[model samples]
Target: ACDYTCGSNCYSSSDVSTAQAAGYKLHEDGETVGSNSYPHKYNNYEGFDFSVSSPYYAWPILSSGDVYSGGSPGADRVVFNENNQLAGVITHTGASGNNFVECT
Candidate 1:
């Protein structure tokens, strides 16, 4: 288990195709959109402050990697590993459209 201060509370997948299908998009890094989904007071992380209206964060990957984001709202924590080893810290704000997150 790891512990660190989160930058935002709300999070979504990096796969734009997936998000678009759901009628949404990843939150842009360092870009605050709107506050609609969840309430801000519910999630009050120092840097990680997001509401439902917040756009999904975007991420760039070589392959069709998974982008996991979101924790407990206040302290959104994302953890993942390929083959039971450290792959990489998942970042929100998935790709744009179907060309967002792609795999080999």
Candidate 2:
């Protein structure tokens, strides 16, 4: 069963873990992938009810089961803070313009 749902996309816990691993690793090494420079700061303008701390980084979480290397980042993302902790899952699918909606 899908542990998280972001609009029409379905994802399991492993997918989130996998994505977070890559993004956090890059962040630790001061690196970035994709054209938009992922692992970028996520201001949480949408104001999600997350237990994790602020100064979060947004990294692309792919349901394709592959780590993001370059090119398009699709929709869903995994948010984590500098302390390397999961803030929450989010997606650009259900929101207007470039904003994101939280994945439950």
Report, for all candidates in order, the number of backbone clashes. Answer: 24, 0
For all predicted structures, in order, the TM-scores are: 0.18, 0.95
- List, residue by residue over 1-104, the lDDT tens digit for candidate 1: 11211232222344433322222123212232233322112121223323233223222221222332332222222322111211122332243332211111
User: Candidate 2: where is the Cα deviation over 4 Å?
Assistant: none
Q: After superposition, how far is residue 34 of candidate 1 from its true place, in Å?
A: 26
State the displacement of the C-alpha of residue 47, model 1, in Å, after optimal TM-score superposition: 28
Q: Among these predicted structures, which one has the highest lDDT?
A: 2
- lDDT value for candidate 2? 0.90
Candidate models: Cα lDDT each: 0.26, 0.90
Best by TM-score: 2
lDDT of 2 by residue, 2-100 (tens): 989998889898888889999999999998888999989999888898898898999998877888988788898999999988999999998999899
lDDT of 1: 0.26
